[PDB]
């Protein structure tokens, strides 16, 4: 089962689990109140999976590619890794389906406290436009992820503060409507 938790107060070593003590787990239902949605798939089948196709058609995920984050293969690795972990938002959904390996997507809750989401092979997530978030590898230091997009992609991050954007305003309005 996909795991998420409130983070501790240490600012060192982003790749460690950083579980708050005592444990404060976060449920998929609480994540939905933040607009964060999740599906579980068989990642071995990703090249030809009717279940993935059902989600892509439902959600209008008409575009995809594959990215591999590995200290060796990935160009500008050190710079990209730093960028990924900077708190930012996008004006579009951020949709990621983990094909191999694992990593952490952190999101702000309604009180602007960090929640860490542990994503592993088979896990698919969408972070809504406007949500403040960041990504890091975990201590296994490897992930292969499918990126999906509603139409032709724009990857631009806006590092916090980015509060003026319509996407952020609309997201804040969405938050008023959930539990
Ligand atoms: Ni992002």
């Amino acid at each position: 089962m996909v795991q998420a938790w409130y983070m501790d107060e240490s600012t060192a070593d982003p790749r460690k689990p950083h579980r708050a003590q005592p444990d404060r787990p976060v449920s998929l239902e609480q994540l939905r109140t933040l607009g964060v949605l999740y599906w579980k798939l068989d990642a071995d089948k990703y090249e030809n999976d009717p279940e993935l196709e059902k989600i892509r058609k439902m959600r209008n995920y008409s575009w995809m590619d594959i990215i591999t984050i590995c200290k060796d293969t990935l160009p500008n690795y050190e710079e990209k890794i730093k960028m990924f972990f900077e708190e930012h938002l996008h004006l579009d959904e951020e949709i990621r389906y983990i094909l191999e390996g694992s990593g952490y997507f952190d999101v702000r809750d309604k009180e602007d406290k960090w929640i860490r989401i542990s994503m592993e092979k088979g896990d698919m997530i969408t972070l809504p436009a406007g949500i403040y978030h960041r990504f890091t590898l975990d201590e296994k230091n490897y992930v292969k992820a499918m990126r999906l997009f509603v139409g032709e992609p724009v990857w631009t991050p806006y590092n916090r503060p980015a509060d003026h954007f319509d996407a952020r305003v609309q997201y804040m309005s969405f938050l008023e409507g959930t539990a």
Side-chain angles (χ1 to χ4, degrees), residues 2 4-15 17-28 30-52 54-66 68-70 72-78 81 83-110 112 114-139 141-179:
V2 62
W5 56 85
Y6 279 93
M7 301 187 63
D8 63 24
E9 81 280 358
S10 167
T11 63
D13 305 323
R15 297 184 190 200
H18 282 275
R19 295 177 175 268
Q21 290 309 130
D23 286 325
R24 302 169 57 212
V26 171
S27 72
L28 285 179
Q30 181 181 358
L31 289 179
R32 282 195 298 277
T33 69
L34 306 179
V36 173
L37 309 178
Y38 169 85
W39 303 271
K40 173 70 176 86
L41 297 168
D42 179 350
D44 289 322
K45 292 181 64 170
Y46 77 87
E47 294 183 74
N48 191 352
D49 181 11
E51 290 301 309
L52 172 61
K54 284 178 187 176
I55 298 160
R56 296 189 59 183
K57 289 178 166 183
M58 172 180 70
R59 299 288 295 181
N60 200 11
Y61 300 152
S62 57
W63 188 98
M64 74 91 128
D65 81 340
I66 308 287
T68 301
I69 305 177
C70 185
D72 314 322
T73 155
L74 183 70
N76 285 123
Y77 175 84
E78 294 298 344
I81 258 48
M83 169 183 301
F84 292 158
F85 198 61
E86 282 306 303
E87 180 174 14
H88 67 275
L89 61 73
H90 307 289
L91 310 188
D92 303 277
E93 278 176 83
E94 168 158 313
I95 309 115
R96 299 290 183 274
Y97 174 28
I98 306 306
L99 304 182
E100 306 183 358
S102 58
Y104 296 130
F105 292 83
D106 303 335
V107 302
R108 295 284 191 177
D109 80 350
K110 288 192 176 178
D112 258 324
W114 283 120
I115 293 167
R116 171 148 287 186
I117 309 173
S118 176
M119 294 285 290
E120 308 182 319
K121 175 176 181 179
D123 293 332
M124 180 173 172
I125 192 171
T126 168
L127 314 176
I131 199 170
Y132 283 126
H133 66 283
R134 59 183 181 198
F135 173 81
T136 177
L137 299 165
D138 55 36
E139 292 192 274
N141 300 282
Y142 170 70
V143 78
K144 177 189 175 187
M146 182 185 296
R147 306 187 293 177
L148 300 95
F149 210 91
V150 179
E152 291 292 317
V154 169
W155 301 119
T156 309
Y158 293 100
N159 292 339
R160 189 170 195 174
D163 300 298
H164 88 268
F165 288 102
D166 182 51
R168 176 61 179 183
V169 177
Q170 295 191 45
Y171 178 65
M172 296 290 286
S173 166
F174 164 86
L175 286 180
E176 302 183 30
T178 61

